[PDB]
Amino acid sequence: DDWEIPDGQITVGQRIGSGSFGTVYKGKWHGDVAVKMLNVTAPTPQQLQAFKNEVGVLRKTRHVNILLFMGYSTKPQLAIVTQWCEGSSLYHHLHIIETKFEMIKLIDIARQTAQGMDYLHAKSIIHRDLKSNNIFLHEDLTVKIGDFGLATVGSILWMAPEVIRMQDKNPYSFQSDVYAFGIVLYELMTGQLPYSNINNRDQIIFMVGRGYLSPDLSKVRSNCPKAMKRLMAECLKKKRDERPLFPQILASIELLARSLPK
Numbered sequence: 286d287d288w289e290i291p292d293g294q295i296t297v298g299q300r301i302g303s304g305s306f307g308t309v310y311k312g313k314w315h316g317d318v319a320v321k322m323l324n325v326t327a328p329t330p331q332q333l334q335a336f337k338n339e340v341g342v343l344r345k346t347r348h349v350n351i352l353l354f355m356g357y358s359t360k361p362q363l364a365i366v367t368q369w370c371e372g373s374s375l376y377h378h379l380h381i382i383e384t385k386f387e388m389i390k391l392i393d394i395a396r397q398t399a400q401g402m403d404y405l406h407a408k409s410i411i412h413r414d415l416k417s418n419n420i421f422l423h424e425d426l427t428v429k430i431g432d433f434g435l436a437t438v439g440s441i442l443w444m445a446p447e448v449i450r451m452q453d454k455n456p457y458s459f460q461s462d463v464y465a466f467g468i469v470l471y472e473l474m475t476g477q478l479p480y481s482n483i484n485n486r487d488q489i490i491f492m493v494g495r496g497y498l499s500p501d502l503s504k505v506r507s508n509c510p511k512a513m514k515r516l517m518a519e520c521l522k523k524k525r526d527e528r529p530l531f532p533q534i535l536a537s538i539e540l541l542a543r544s545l546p547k
């Protein structure tokens with residue numbers, strides 16, 4: 286039944302980037318797979334935990350919208366094998382190669398991302414690092430939520446304010462996730478990273494912390510539905526108790542999706 290993979294089966298190839306606690310590669314193991322290696326030399330008990338944690342979460346996820354966990358390896362190095370997705374992460378599409386999607390497609394990307402988050406939360410899984418970087422578009426039409434290195438049961442532009450100013454011990458909640466999703470909604474509807482005009486990172490944390498800065502919602506493109514812009518605002522609420530839980534968030538996007546194509 287177990288998911289550990291025998292030493293030598295996984296064939297590591299190209300290095301393609303990084304992920305939480307590791308280095309991501311494209312590999313081969315019964316086909317193409319993404320591999321995240323949690324070290325070079327010998328494992329810290331720091332790393333040893335984040336590994337056991339992450340695998341322990343992935344193996345609780347079986348959904349079309351969550352990146353498929355396939356196996357893990359310790360023996361050469363700590364490594365996490367998942368399926369592989371041709372075509373890059375939502376971030377790359379939006380801010381690097383500046384793919385211009387149609388509104389129906391953007392909403393759909395939103396509807397899937399929503400779908401998967403609902404899944405995770407229904408399983409008491411908190412992602413704590415949702416961001417268009419970890420949202421992967423497989424075969425260009427299917428959304429996979431990736432990288433659970435920080436999930437439980439670095440990048441600030443998605444952090445809710447309650448997270449940005451550390452108090453108390455536990456800022457992370459289902460709602461801190463919603464807010465992150467709120468920003469990728471913003472990305473989707475604006476094709477832009479928020480606070481793009483401010484070139485100081487530390488100001489942006491301070492200001493979003495103290496509630497002086499918020500995403501500028503007038504940047505949403507004209508053919509974005511009013512219901513979407515309205516839902517976006519709801520998720521980006523500064524007070525966390527005023528934000529919608531994903532079941533409600535899902536129903537909202539599905540509704541406005543059905544009354545769109547006309």
Ligand SMILES: COC(=O)c1oc2cnccc2c1NC1C=CC2=C(NO)C=CC2=C1
Pocket residue numbers: 301302303304309319320321339352365366367368369370371421431432433434
């Ligand atoms: C910069 O990253 C990429 O370009 C990247 O492309 C991919 C294509 N398919 C799957 C995963 C990735 C992935 N990244 C991963 C992120 C997290 C991962 C894991 N988290 O456990 C396991 C394999 C992972 C790949």
